[PDB]
Design a protein around this ligand. Structure first.
Ligand SMILES: CCCCCCCCO[C@@H]1O[C@H](CO)[C@H](O)C[C@H]1O[C@@H]1O[C@@H](C)[C@@H](O)[C@@H](O)[C@@H]1O
Ligand SMILES: CCCCCCCCO[C@@H]1O[C@H](CO)[C@H](O)C[C@H]1O[C@@H]1O[C@@H](C)[C@@H](O)[C@@H](O)[C@@H]1O
Ligand SMILES: O=c1ccn([C@@H]2O[C@H](COP(=O)(O)OP(=O)(O)O)[C@@H](O)[C@H]2O)c(=O)[nH]1
Ligand SMILES: O=c1ccn([C@@H]2O[C@H](COP(=O)(O)OP(=O)(O)O)[C@@H](O)[C@H]2O)c(=O)[nH]1
Ligand SMILES: [Mn+2]
Ligand SMILES: [Mn+2]
Lengths: 297, 297
């Protein structure tokens, strides 16, 4: 449940937060609209686990495995079992054009998996973009009755470390690992005024990822419906945003500020970007792929 | 309104938040349960004003002026007009045993004041404590229909600088200016196990003030009802907590973590504590008083 009566926390023994000692002095840990930016060291997971278990929180995790990307599911799901919301109720929703190719992964107690068959688009861009329509369609029925929060991620990934209830909030995005140190004029937002995703060079807070966002079911429904509608407008006008669904997600999160922002710990590419000092953990990471080969027949 | 459909923010030009630059390196700006700690420099008030004006937010401010404390109202209200939620809808609720002693203060547009007559208790401790009952009684009727948030403060105070929508959240407390640098064993929590306010020496996050707390009407109703009920249990058992309503508020906020914490900028005593470097602003400050004289006939 979200927003129900909250029972008292039990007695807990943990280190006192000290007002005159920051958790992290090397990074921004709160946005200018007072949303936490989630980095290792900023949260006590024991307190958060208590809060969320006392609400019997259920988390849905959506992942698309269309065409050749079914090959990524086994590692994705097996590592999710090790690191994603362990001890909490989890419902995986695997969207695929090949139900028979979904691997048989052994799940911990209180965790379930549903396979949702969908159509495969020819263009990888359309496969990526149509996730917004598909997620919004499934919010309207299944998700509202079955989960409290939705977490929507790419499949070409593996969990390596804890991804837990610290991320949960009405609406979150994740800082793209390529651009967290960049100035806004360098962000690869859509820059053509003819697109609904357009952001001028003097606007923007952060560059968020298309591959890891989420929130309450209500807020995820809103985001995905808005991005789908914006994409349909662009299609009618003969324009496709430079980075597809990610461009639209960035426009949405500029105008509807997220209530938490995840640091790049939560989506990293170690082959491309290494392991900087500012990252104490690499939690969820890119699996190397040959883009041209895996995206086409 | 709270939790209604949120329209898009307009285009705004403001400084980009930089991920590799903290707003404040000298203080903790987020709690271990991912609640912001509100200090100058951590928020862009223009973004926040937009968010809250787009929801047509109404803020109630409760203040008790019982017996001789009616003398503090003129300065309290006149300075509130200069600094408290300016541009937002405000409803002041002045609880008093002397309606005719409430000064005629000129209010800005969109602001109103209601005088609520209540009984005066003999003991200043009981006057302070019974605010919980009185606030919870008035939540049940007036406040739920009239305001979105409640802010509950002491009267023996003046505003000197901005106190605005940065504070608004489901539930907040304020760091006591005497103890923000103290270790938890030094906090003046109730230490007798016989009291409902009891907190052991190895528990506690912060020492919060009885004089400045608030939140949504629902959460303030919960807090005030719980503290009143706990006080009634103590009374039946022949014990009065060491710091009265403040002791109970501290117990409640230990077990029900606030969703924002206000820094001591928001309740300061300059005569007792000066103006430390860590305080960039003194927003709401103690008016000097002779405690013995003003609390008794
Ligand atoms: C400046 C150097 C940035 C290098 C990272 C670029 O990543 C790509 O960013 C695009 C937006 O500009 C879009 O999000 C695709 C993204 O590439 C994906 O994510 C990377 C982190 C890699 O894993 C890459 O292989 C993947 O295709
Ligand atoms: C260590 C030195 C701390 C000095 C501040 C003590 O303030 C008092 O704290 C009590 C709890 O221990 C309780 O909250 C009353 C509080 O005194 C009030 O607030 C102060 C900041 C002063 O304005 C004082 O005159 C007022 O009575
Ligand atoms: O043929 C495809 C292309 C894309 N995707 C899905 O769309 C996501 C985004 O595409 P991709 O991971 O290639 O984008 P990148 O991370 O490289 O930006 C993938 O993770 C898959 O979940 C898919 O299932 N099959
Ligand atoms: O005779 C009294 C005693 C207390 N109060 C109210 O109770 C609050 C708390 O008391 P006080 O300010 O004396 O406490 P302190 O700040 O000194 O702890 C005051 O601000 C008033 O709002 C009052 O109205 N009349
Ligand atoms: Mn990917
Ligand atoms: Mn006072």
């Amino acid at each position: 449940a979200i927003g129900e009566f909250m029972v008292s926390l039990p007695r807990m023994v943990y280190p006192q937060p000290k007002v005159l000692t920051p958790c992290r002095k090397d990074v921004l840990v709160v946005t200018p609209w007072l949303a936490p930016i989630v980095w290792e060291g900023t949260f006590n997971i024991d307190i958060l686990n208590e809060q969320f278990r006392l609400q019997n929180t259920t988390i849905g995790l959506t992942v698309f495995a269309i065409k050749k990307y079914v090959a990524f599911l086994k590692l994705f799901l097996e590592t999710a079992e090790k690191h994603f919301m362990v001890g909490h109720r989890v419902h995986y929703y695997v969207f695929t054009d090949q139900p028979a190719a979904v691997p048989r992964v052994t799940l911990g107690t209180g965790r379930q998996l549903s396979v949702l068959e969908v159509r495969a688009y020819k263009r990888w861009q359309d496969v990526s973009m149509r996730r917004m329509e598909m997620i919004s369609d499934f919010c309207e029925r299944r998700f509202l009755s079955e989960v409290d929060y939705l977490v929507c991620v790419d499949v070409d990934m593996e969990f390596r470390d804890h991804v837990g209830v610290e991320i949960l909030t009405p609406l979150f995005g994740t800082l793209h690992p390529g651009f967290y140190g960049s100035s806004r004029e360098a962000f690869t937002y859509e820059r053509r005024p003819q697109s609904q995703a357009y952001i001028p060079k003097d606007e923007g807070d952060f560059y968020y990822l298309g591959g890891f966002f989420g929130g309450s079911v209500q807020e995820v429904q809103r985001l995905t419906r808005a991005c789908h509608q914006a994409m349909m407008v662009d299609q009618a006008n003969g324009i496709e945003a430079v980075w597809h669904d990610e461009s639209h997600l960035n426009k949405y999160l500029l105008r509807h500020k997220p209530t938490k922002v995840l640091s790049p710990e939560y989506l990293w590419d170690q082959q491309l970007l290494g392991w900087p000092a500012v990252l104490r953990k690499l939690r969820f990471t890119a699996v190397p792929k040959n883009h041209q080969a895996v995206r086409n027949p």
